[PDB]
């Protein structure tokens, strides 16, 4: 009646030319009462609609390369890509249309594997213009790193922040396959001027130890200010 499709893994880093395997397990039998199993695989590339790859568990849709194959026994199903090409990158979805409501897996993002790369880290104090409006945004930038996993911690006068920041991450870059990330700490002007030292500490596999970028508010020099 209510089928959950458990699709694994959620992301799959692969080298071009390598074999890739994606599994999908249904929470119970998806054999229709007519004996058929309506299991389908879709691929959605960025900026595009999903496209049909395989229907009825193992049938290749017309125009789909034979390097794609599907199989399935019981409640376990598998999509196999014998040799991954660049155009195969994107998010794969399994789908059962045997029982109502039809349901999708959560998706598997096929990504390009590469060597670890440390981020270049930058910090930006709020602009004078923004402060005049009563808000302070502090921005921490992580440039060109791999893999995607990174830890960014905001600290204000050594106090660890939580709940007042938001992160944004780019997709894999088309040339070097790295990611970039921005973290924005947002405070009222009043709260921002309550404290002296603003810091973001970055933990990443590419770094031997975490890197910190910081600034001292009210500064950049002078004796007598301003």
């Amino acid at each position: 009646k209510d089928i959950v499709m458990t699709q694994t893994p959620s992301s799959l880093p692969v080298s071009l030319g390598d074999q890739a395997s994606i599994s999908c397990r249904s929470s119970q039998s998806i054999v229709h009462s007519n004996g058929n199993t309506y299991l389908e695989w879709y691929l959605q590339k960025p900026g595009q609609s999903p496209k049909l790859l395989i229907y009825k568990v193992s049938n290749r849709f017309s125009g789909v390369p034979d390097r794609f194959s599907g199989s399935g026994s019981g409640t376990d199903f598998t999509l196999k890509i014998s040799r991954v090409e660049a155009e195969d990158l994107g998010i794969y979805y399994c789908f059962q249309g045997s029982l109502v409501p039809p349901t999708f897996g959560a998706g598997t993002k096929l990504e390009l594997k590469r060597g670890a790369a440390a981020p270049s880290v930058f910090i930006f104090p709020p602009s004078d213009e923004q402060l005049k409006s009563g808000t302070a945004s502090v921005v921490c930038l992580l440039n060109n790193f791999y893999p995607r996993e990174a830890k960014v911690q905001w600290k204000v006068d050594n106090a660890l922040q939580s709940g007042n920041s938001q992160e944004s991450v780019t997709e894999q870059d088309s040339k070097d396959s790295t990611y970039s990330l921005s973290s924005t700490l947002t405070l009222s002007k009043a709260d921002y001027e309550k404290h002296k030292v603003y810091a973001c500490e970055v933990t990443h596999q590419g770094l031997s130890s975490p890197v910190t970028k910081s600034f001292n508010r009210g500064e950049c020099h002078h004796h007598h200010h301003h």
Binding site: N36, Y38, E40, Y42, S49, P50, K51, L52, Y55, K56, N59, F61, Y93, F95, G97, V100, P101, P102, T103, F104, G105, A106, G107, A118, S120, F122, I123, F124, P125, P126, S127, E129, Q130, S133, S137, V139, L141, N143, Q166, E167, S168, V169, T170, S180, S182, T184, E201, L207, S208, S209, P210, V211, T212, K213, S214, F215, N216, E219, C220, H221
Partner: protein, 229 residues
């Protein structure tokens, strides 16, 4: 010549309704075995099936919609319509129609529409405030904070498109205020900061606003660095 074309994007207030369309070409909606699925895709919610209408005009709906959806097909235009009532922010998504391709392909969704973005929010259309991220191995990063706008998208270019290398424009994030915010950054030679002009161009067509913000060096910076490897 089989094709599905959907209506344009929609921005709407909570509690309101939305009616989106799906026009089919190259085949007949009345062909035995054919049907039209509606599916939505959300940022972290993947794909969910919504509703289906069959060639014989039989209609089925996902219980999760709580009877808020209605399918109509007026067979003049070979167009199917999906109406969703009493919207909230959780209805914000990309909505697709797709053809259930009959017995020959075991009712697989072989052809899809281009998708329709539905954004449900109480925020009014509003242009962004643009603030500089002042520049600070011989490489410096600078950029612009594009804050408090609605709806998506904005377009950001540097020096009217002359500067493209090392540019990163981040996906917008929805703030708790119902407004979007993003940053665009670029890395440049630090020796260029005194003499090269850097201008972010921010276009926001929904509010018909264009902003050019020059980003200037800070005059002094004391950014400290600790740890690392």
């Amino acid at each position: 010549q089989v094709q599905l074309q959907q209506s344009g994007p929609e921005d709407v207030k909570p509690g309101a309704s939305v009616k989106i369309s799906c026009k089919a070409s190259g085949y007949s909606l009345s062909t035995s075995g054919m049907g039209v699925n509606w599916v939505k895709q959300s940022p972290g919610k993947g794909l969910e099936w919504l509703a289906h209408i069959y060639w014989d005009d039989d209609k089925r709906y996902n219980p999760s919609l709580k009877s808020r959806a209605t399918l109509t097909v007026d067979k003049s235009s070979s167009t199917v319509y999906l109406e969703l009532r009493s919207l909230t922010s959780e209805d914000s998504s990309v909505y697709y129609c797709a053809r259930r391709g009959g017995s020959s392909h075991y009712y697989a969704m072989d052809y899809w529409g281009q998708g329709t973005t539905v954004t449900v929010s109480s925020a009014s259309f509003k242009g962004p405030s643009v603030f500089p991220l002042a520049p600070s191995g011989g490489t410096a990063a600078l950029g612009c904070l594009v804050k408090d706008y609605f709806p998506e998208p904005v377009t950001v270019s540097w020096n009217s498109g002359a500067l493209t290398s090392g540019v990163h424009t981040f996906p917008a994030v929805l703030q708790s205020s119902g407004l979007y915010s993003l940053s665009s950054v670029v890395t440049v030679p630090s020796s260029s900061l005194g003499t090269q002009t850097y201008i972010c161009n921010v276009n926001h067509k929904p509010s018909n606003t264009k902003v050019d913000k020059k980003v200037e060096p800070k005059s002094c910076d004391k950014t400290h660095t600790g740890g690392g490897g």
